[PDB]
């Protein structure tokens, strides 16, 4: 299955957001991250990807397709707006085994706020 997540200058949750900020996909599914507004990218957050997963970082303004294979939770950020909380979570599969490692990772306050809310949306 193929999903899309947009990087936006604003949305419902304020400025500098991923929409949706939380998404659950099956292993093997793809997500295309779309900087619909200029000035955004997508990058894995250090400490917030499961075992077997690769870190990734898109170029600013590129639509970036990732095929998620390793089960677990993934925290992602927009590199330039990470300090203003421009983050999202992708959960791949059920019962993510890295949940306690993710929940422990260090983030800017505004990022941590939105990550916690995203994790919670997923029912974690
Ligand atoms: Cu951005």
What token pair was written down for 71?
């089960």
- The reply, when asked if residue 86 is annotated as ligand binding, is yes
The CA-based dihedral angle spanning residues 100, 75, 116, 83, taken in that order and rounded to the nearest 10 degrees: 130
CA of 110 to the centre of ligand 1 (A): 13
Spatial distance between the Cα atoms of 65 and 73, rounded to a whole number of angstroms: 17
3-state secondary structure of 15: strand
> In angstroms, what is the resolution?
1.2
Domain count, the chain: 1
CA of 40 to the centre of ligand 1 (A): 4
- The reply, when asked if residue 6 is annotated as ligand binding, is no
What token pair was written down for 111?
């990022």
Phi, psi dihedrals of residue 9, rounded to the nearest 5° = -70, -30
Spatial distance between the Cα atoms of 24 and 60, rounded to a whole number of angstroms: 24
How does DSSP classify residue 109? H
Closest CA to 18 of 3, 30, 1, 29: 3
3-state secondary structure of 33: strand
What token pair was written down for 3?
């999903």
Q: Where in 1-124 does DSSP place strands (E)? A: 2-11, 14-19, 22-25, 30-35, 43-44, 64-67, 72-77, 87-92
CA of 81 to the centre of ligand 1 (A): 5
Spatial distance between the Cα atoms of 14 and 36, rounded to a whole number of angstroms: 16
Closest CA to 119 of 54, 61, 72, 83: 72
Experimental method: X-ray
Whats the size of the chain, residue-wise? 124
Domain of residue 36 covers 1-124
* CATH number, domain containing residue 3: 2.60.40.420
Q: What pairs with residue 67 in β-bridges? A: 30
How does DSSP classify residue 82? G
The CA-based dihedral angle spanning residues 77, 82, 86, 89, taken in that order and rounded to the nearest 10 degrees: 30
CA of 6 to the centre of ligand 1 (A): 11
Spatial distance between the Cα atoms of 39 and 59, rounded to a whole number of angstroms: 10
**Would you give the distance in Å from CA 4 to the centre of its chain?**
12
């Amino acid at each position: 299955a193929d999903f899309e997540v947009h990087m936006l200058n604003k949305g419902k949750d304020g400025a500098f957001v991923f929409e949706p900020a939380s998404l659950k996909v099956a292993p093997g599914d793809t997500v295309t991250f779309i900087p619909k507004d200029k000035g955004h990218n997508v990058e894995t957050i250090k400490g917030m990807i499961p075992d077997g997963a690769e870190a990734f970082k898109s170029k600013i303004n590129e639509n970036y397709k990732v095929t998620f294979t390793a089960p677990g939770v993934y925290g992602v950020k927009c590199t330039p707006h990470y300090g203003m909380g421009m983050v999202g979570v992708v959960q791949v599969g059920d019962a993510p085994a890295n949940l306690e490692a993710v929940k422990g990772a260090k983030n800017p306050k505004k990022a941590q706020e939105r990550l916690d809310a995203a994790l919670a949306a997923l029912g974690n």
